[PDB]
Amino acid sequence: MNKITINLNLNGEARSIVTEPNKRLLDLLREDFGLTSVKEGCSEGECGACTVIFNGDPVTTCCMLAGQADESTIITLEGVAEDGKPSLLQQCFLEAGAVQCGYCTPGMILTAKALLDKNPDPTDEEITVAMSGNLCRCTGYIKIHAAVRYAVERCAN
Amino acid sequence: MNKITINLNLNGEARSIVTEPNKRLLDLLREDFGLTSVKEGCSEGECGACTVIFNGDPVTTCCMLAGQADESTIITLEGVAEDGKPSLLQQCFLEAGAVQCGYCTPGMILTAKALLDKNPDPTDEEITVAMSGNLCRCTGYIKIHAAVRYAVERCANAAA
Amino acid sequence: GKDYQVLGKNKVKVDSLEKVMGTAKFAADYSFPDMLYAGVFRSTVPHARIVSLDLSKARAIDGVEAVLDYHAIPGKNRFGIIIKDEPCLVDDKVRRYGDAIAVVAAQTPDLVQEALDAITIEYEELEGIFTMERALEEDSPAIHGDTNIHQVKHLEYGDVDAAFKQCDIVVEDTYSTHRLTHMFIEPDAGVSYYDNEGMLTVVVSTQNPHYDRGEVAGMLALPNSKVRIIQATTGGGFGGKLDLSVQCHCALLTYHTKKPVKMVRSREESTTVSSKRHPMTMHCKTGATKDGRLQAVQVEMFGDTGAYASYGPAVITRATVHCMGPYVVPNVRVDAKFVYTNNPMSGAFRGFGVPQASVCHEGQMNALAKALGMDPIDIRILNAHQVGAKLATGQVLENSVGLIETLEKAREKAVEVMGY
Amino acid sequence: GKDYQVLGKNKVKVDSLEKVMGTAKFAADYSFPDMLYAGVFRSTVPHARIVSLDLSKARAIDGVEAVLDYHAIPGKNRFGIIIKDEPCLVDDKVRRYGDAIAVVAAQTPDLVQEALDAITIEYEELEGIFTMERALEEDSPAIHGDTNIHQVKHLEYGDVDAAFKQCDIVVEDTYSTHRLTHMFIEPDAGVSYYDNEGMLTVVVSTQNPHYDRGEVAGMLALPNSKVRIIQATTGGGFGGKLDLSVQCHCALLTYHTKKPVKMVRSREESTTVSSKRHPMTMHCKTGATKDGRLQAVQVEMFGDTGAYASYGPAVITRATVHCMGPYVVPNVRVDAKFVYTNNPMSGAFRGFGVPQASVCHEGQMNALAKALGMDPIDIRILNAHQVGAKLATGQVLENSVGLIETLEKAREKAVEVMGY
Ligand SMILES: Nc1ccn([C@@H]2O[C@H](COP(=O)(O)OP(=O)(O)OC[C@H]3Oc4nc5nc(N)nc(O)c5nc4C(S)=C3S)[C@@H](O)[C@H]2O)c(=O)n1
Ligand code: FES
Ligand code: FES
Ligand code: FES
Ligand code: FES
Ligand SMILES: [Ca+2]
Ligand SMILES: [Mg+2]
Numbered sequence A: 001m002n003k004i005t006i007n008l009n010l011n012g013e014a015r016s017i018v019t020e021p022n023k024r025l026l027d028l029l030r031e032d033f034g035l036t037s038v039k040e041g042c043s044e045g046e047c048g049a050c051t052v053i054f055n056g057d058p059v060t061t062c063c064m065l066a067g068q069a070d071e072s073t074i075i076t077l078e079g080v081a082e083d084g085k086p087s088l089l090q091q092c093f094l095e096a097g098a099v100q101c102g103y104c105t106p107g108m109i110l111t112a113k114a115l116l117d118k119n120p121d122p123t124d125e126e127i128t129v130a131m132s133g134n135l136c137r138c139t140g141y142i143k144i145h146a147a148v149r150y151a152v153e154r155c156a157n
Numbered sequence B: 001m002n003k004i005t006i007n008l009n010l011n012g013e014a015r016s017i018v019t020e021p022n023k024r025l026l027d028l029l030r031e032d033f034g035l036t037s038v039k040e041g042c043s044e045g046e047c048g049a050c051t052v053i054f055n056g057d058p059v060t061t062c063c064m065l066a067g068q069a070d071e072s073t074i075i076t077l078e079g080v081a082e083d084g085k086p087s088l089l090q091q092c093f094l095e096a097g098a099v100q101c102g103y104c105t106p107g108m109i110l111t112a113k114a115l116l117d118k119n120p121d122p123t124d125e126e127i128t129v130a131m132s133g134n135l136c137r138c139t140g141y142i143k144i145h146a147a148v149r150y151a152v153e154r155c156a157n158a159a160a
Numbered sequence C, D: 001g002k003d004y005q006v007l008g009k010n011k012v013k014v015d016s017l018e019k020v021m022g023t024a025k026f027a028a029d030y031s032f033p034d035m036l037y038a039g040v041f042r043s044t045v046p047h048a049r050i051v052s053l054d055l056s057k058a059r060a061i062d063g064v065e066a067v068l069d070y071h072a073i074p075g076k077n078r079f080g081i082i083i084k085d086e087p088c089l090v091d092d093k094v095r096r097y098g099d100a101i102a103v104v105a106a107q108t109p110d111l112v113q114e115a116l117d118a119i120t121i122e123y124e125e126l127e128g129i130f131t132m133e134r135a136l137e138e139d140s141p142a143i144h145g146d147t148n149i150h151q152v153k154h155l156e157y158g159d160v161d162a163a164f165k166q167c168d169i170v171v172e173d174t175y176s177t178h179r180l181t182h183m184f185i186e187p188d189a190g191v192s193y194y195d196n197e198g199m200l201t202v203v204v205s206t207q208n209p210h211y212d213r214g215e216v217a218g219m220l221a222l223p224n225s226k227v228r229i230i231q232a233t234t235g236g237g238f239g240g241k242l243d244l245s246v247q248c249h250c251a252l253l254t255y256h257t258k259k260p261v262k263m264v265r266s267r268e269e270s271t272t273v274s275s276k277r278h279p280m281t282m283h284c285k286t287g288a289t290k291d292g293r294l295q296a297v298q299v300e301m302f303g304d305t306g307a308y309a310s311y312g313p314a315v316i317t318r319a320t321v322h323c324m325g326p327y328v329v330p331n332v333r334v335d336a337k338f339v340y341t342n343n344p345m346s347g348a349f350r351g352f353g354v355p356q357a358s359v360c361h362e363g364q365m366n367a368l369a370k371a372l373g374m375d376p377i378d379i380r381i382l383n384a385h386q387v388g389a390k391l392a393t394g395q396v397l398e399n400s401v402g403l404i405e406t407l408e409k410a411r412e413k414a415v416e417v418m419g420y
């Protein structure tokens, strides 16, 4: 097995790394790039905790091989903050009560951001289906959704 | 400036590193090898806090270029412990009250050890001269010297 | 109401910022220099004796720093949140599937798994008990001690044998609740190490750091003050993280290698090893009169606490005391028995045996409400607890009782939203 | 003497283990991911206004993240252990050599130095004051406010004018001590950062973390509960690490870059910038009768507090309260005047003015003993403080007074070991 060269745009910057391909994209991000916001809750693509914005689209990084992130644009929770400050979405999650244990939060926010970056004014239903790939055992999903609805409204102005 | 390859035996094991030559051995040990026990109290050879055992002799690492550690055997405080436990000498510093702020201690212990590895039963005068390159602002040296003397006696004691 | 400065207000939580920013670190997010990785070699049988265990080939792998069994423990090898019947590493015998037999520490996760697949073991299987029936048989093989009867409680209030004669209605039925798992989104994780000052420390996903401290200190024979447990940001527990998970296994390895030991359970191993809700069966008979006032409740329940006690003693006790819903019952009889089995360890899960008990009594009430043409709410409001009432334990409610309000306000809201 | 369970015993220190093992971490031994290095651009003139300051060229260097002057501080820019007369970064004017003017944060120590070398500045030099004589001349520029007089104290006890007339012997001499530096073996060092939960933090070599905190919080306009100061294993202080060293410069650079900022001072800069012992000159007249009994002490002293107050207040009063020595003197008068100068900042150095005072009172006692042909120890035992003695401040000693025992034990030992 020979190491492969991987070029990608991670959190707004052009990165490049030569490493062994025998690993998942989740491992690459957590271990090689130190992005620990990307959680691993099941290892089978179910919980969504390992969700990251892969080319405008959210994806389960526990289902992808490191090499597949080549030539792609990836955004993890660390990339959401604006110059170290909580974005609008993040602020809404804070005030809405959408956060209990916080293990699912990164994925939730990334899924909600991916959505809002395509559909600024989504329907509550479009919001639901949009985040149906992320499981939470704490909130019942209610207040998480409210935070998204909250953000959209403040997005109007 | 081309990088150089430095081969040395560090704390018992053969290490090898390819690095820039424009750094002191003190920097190599602290930064590249993570041995923070090696202190920088003055940068000019006076305090002895950056002392390491070099090919059997105590030397001030702030006075040396990294490449000069090539083909050498070096022992820092981290390499004195025996299986994660305090060596006899270290146990003696603990008990003799030789430790106050503890900043000059790595140097004191290494200098003491360097002496004992050569001369297991030194005279008090020999102990003093041997450690005269290490400055301390807390102890007044009294108990640091006692610790070494105590180690020498307990070592002989181990004549069972 | 009752004007408060900050109380009641929806203040942004003190730990939400780091959670939404992604800087918050859960156990598995921690990494240290020279940090080794750990894995646990567990049993594949449910009940047996270890005839032969070979760790020689595992240890011989270049990259594996340690492989240990119970012999490696300097202190005690019996733990438990209530009853010390849980080993850190099987010594006595295997009492369940996934029992901790040995632990490994290596430089990489794969080297951990490699060292694990190299271990061989021989079993002398016993009769794996899986039903409460076979477990009660004075004939069955004792999983613990000389009996499979873990807990037995009996509550007697007033005289039910009599009251059951002053009732115009009496309903009997058997209830049964299944086995469930907390399923917190964050799998079990922990990391142990000796800090810069020599302090043995364990960062871990837990619900009770201080309890964990005692066990670790016990295992290593160290005074509590010399063992530090740091409850890291925890991704849910719901009761599944009260029992020990990786604390002792990590600490044990850090004790022997003196290096940091990280252990992150896969979802599979996490679910396989953690405790489960107590599956229960409850035989009940409630007697009431025309008007609807309850006169006497009688219950006989059983419980499958699993291979180990865990919160079993607390589950049976709390269940016994609540089996007769939040209603005033002048006569109560309760017989409860929990037994050890080779089924997954039963312990604490949101409710402490009350959810199971709620099904039983609420099932009866709704049953009486159906046999008396009463509205499920009213028949409840009638027998609802109030300040001054007397409990099956002889205790009298002296304050904070808003059960009827939850019944009226709720019904009201239901009407407004679902047309009650 | 009281059978203590553990008190008095030569117990191994709770922190000696890390020190002998080399694991103990002093501030400079800390390193964090993405950590930047910092340096300070300091004045090379003693007293002057800044005409111009160019930071553009320093900012343009690839690898330099920040180059800040006082304009970058969001909160206050006046600090001080006792008197808030010290800036974090000079605003109105330079008052000493080595005054902090701007700070730099960069990816490497070499980049920092490169940034400092690229900063240019133009001063409008004022008169540098280096003598207390010139400082007291009212036409001399005022380093602070409208006068260079920093502190004044006067102790009046009994009546020395009357007393001196009743004396058989009076010794009068002018004493003076010099300027010294602490020279702890570990140079000033610190590192700041926001932790995982967003907590602003500063790990530093200090003697007073809680004081440090209040200052940092005040600079960043934050509540004290939101600024964490962690005193790292400290390589000695002796008073020189009471004043702020790197805490604010680091915290400020972290507040702006949001990254960890490490600042380790070269021995040179540490000495140049840290406090020094107050040099003092004491004029004393001490009177006594033939039997060697003290009747009156009169001291007129001056202290050079340097550019900033630091412990100037603490030093002048402590020195004033003790300058008659550990002796019962029924009549004492003390005049003390400490002045600001552009000399290095005088602060706290083991003794707070008493070492300087003792040179005086002991010099007097020895001249008395010699002239009266008495044994130096005897003349001291005769006038020594004892429980019950009345102090020059009106205070009467009520307990714990063993001066005579030190005197006797000391002489007894010296007779034996040095032939006293
Ligand atoms: N009068 C009250 C009561 C509760 N609360 C809120 O609700 C929480 C629950 O408080 P409490 O009922 O006192 O229970 P504990 O804090 O002791 O939490 C443990 C409890 O919490 C439960 N809910 C959980 N919620 C989350 N997010 N994660 C778990 O693991 C949970 N596990 C369960 C289980 S099981 C248990 S035993 C408080 O932190 C508080 O934010 C409140 O504001 N005012
Ligand atoms: S770990 Fe990827 S979806 Fe759960
Ligand atoms: S808040 Fe805990 S899993 Fe979502
Ligand atoms: S730093 Fe090397 S002798 Fe002082
Ligand atoms: S113990 Fe502090 S310098 Fe030696
Ligand atoms: Ca626990
Ligand atoms: Mg300080």
Ligand SMILES: [Mg+2]
Pocket: D304, D305, D306, D307, D308, D309, D310, D311, D312, D345, D346, D347
């Ligand atoms: Mg001063």
Ligand SMILES: [Se]
Pocket: C238, C239, C240, C348, C349, C350, C351, C352
């Ligand atoms: Se629970």
Ligand SMILES: [Se]
Pocket: D238, D239, D240, D348, D349, D350, D351, D352
């Ligand atoms: Se001091």
